[PDB]
Amino acid sequence: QPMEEEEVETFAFQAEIAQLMSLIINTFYSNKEIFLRELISNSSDALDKIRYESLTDPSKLDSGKELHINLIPNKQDRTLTIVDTGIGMTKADLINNLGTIAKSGTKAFMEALQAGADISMIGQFGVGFYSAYLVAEKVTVITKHNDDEQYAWESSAGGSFTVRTDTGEPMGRGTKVILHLKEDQTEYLEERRIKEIVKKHSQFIGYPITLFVEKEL
Ligand SMILES: Cc1ccccc1[C@H]1CCCN1C(=O)c1ccc(O)cc1O
């Protein structure tokens, strides 16, 4: 009878990760724009990985040979999406690497901030993904790894995230980070803003970065 039915799992964030997310989403910072640099850096790393694999196994690219990053503002949905065709994440990858396992860099980073370091350094501690919450009230991550199903990860912070199978629109391979922006952060939906931040901070990314301005007609 139902059109669709999907099992949804809810996981608690590891304690230090939950602390970091609260610090990030609540604290005032003057340089929030660095979130885009961090997410693009993540995409680049994921692209480096699938590329490495394809060096010895070309069939790794059967799911798509183009290695690139797309930025997609949607003013109607108030979302900014960063899409890449990197190696993507398995379900275990999602759960392990985006929430439940703390890396040493998590506590280290919060220690660094209290010691006077800047939020812009977050990427050096290996947790730059969470800078997304500088500007987003909710983040949705859609991801597809070779040989695996497509999954959707989601969290509005507050201590937990969900995982479920995603059947919406099939990706060949890679990861899509959908930022549901805070009301006062909608500037990052504007073309001039996206362009100047990419020019300023992502100068040396070795993959094509393309803007797609989305409007439902
Ligand atoms: C960098 C990183 C940190 C933690 C977990 C996974 C990753 C990368 C490398 C392996 C797969 N992966 C992604 O799918 C991915 C994730 C977030 C993101 O914003 C863009 C992405 O492409």
From Swiss-Prot:
Belongs to the heat shock protein 90 family. Molecular chaperone that promotes the maturation, structural maintenance and proper regulation of specific target proteins involved for instance in cell cycle control and signal transduction. Undergoes a functional cycle that is linked to its ATPase activity which is essential for its chaperone activity. This cycle probably induces conformational changes in the client proteins, thereby causing their activation. Interacts dynamically with various co-chaperones that modulate its substrate recognition, ATPase cycle and chaperone function. (Microbial infection) Seems to interfere with N.meningitidis NadA-mediated invasion of human cells. Decreasing HSP90 levels increases adhesion and entry of E.coli expressing NadA into human Chang cells; increasing its levels leads to decreased adhesion and invasion. Homodimer. Identified in NR3C1/GCR steroid receptor-chaperone complexes formed at least by NR3C1, HSP90AA1 and a variety of proteins containing TPR repeats such as FKBP4, FKBP5, PPID, PPP5C or STIP1. Forms a complex containing HSP90AA1, TSC1 and TSC2; TSC1 is required to recruit TCS2 to the complex. The closed form interacts (via the middle domain and TPR repeat-binding motif) with co-chaperone TSC1 (via C-terminus). Interacts with TOM34. Interacts with TERT; the interaction, together with PTGES3, is required for correct assembly and stabilization of the TERT holoenzyme complex. It comes from Homo sapiens. ISGylated. S-nitrosylated; negatively regulates the ATPase activity and the activation of eNOS by HSP90AA1. The gene is HSP90AA1. Transmembrane segments: none annotated. The TPR repeat-binding motif mediates interaction with TPR repeat-containing proteins like the co-chaperone STUB1. Residues 1-216 are annotated as: Interaction with NR3C1. This is Heat shock protein HSP 90-alpha.
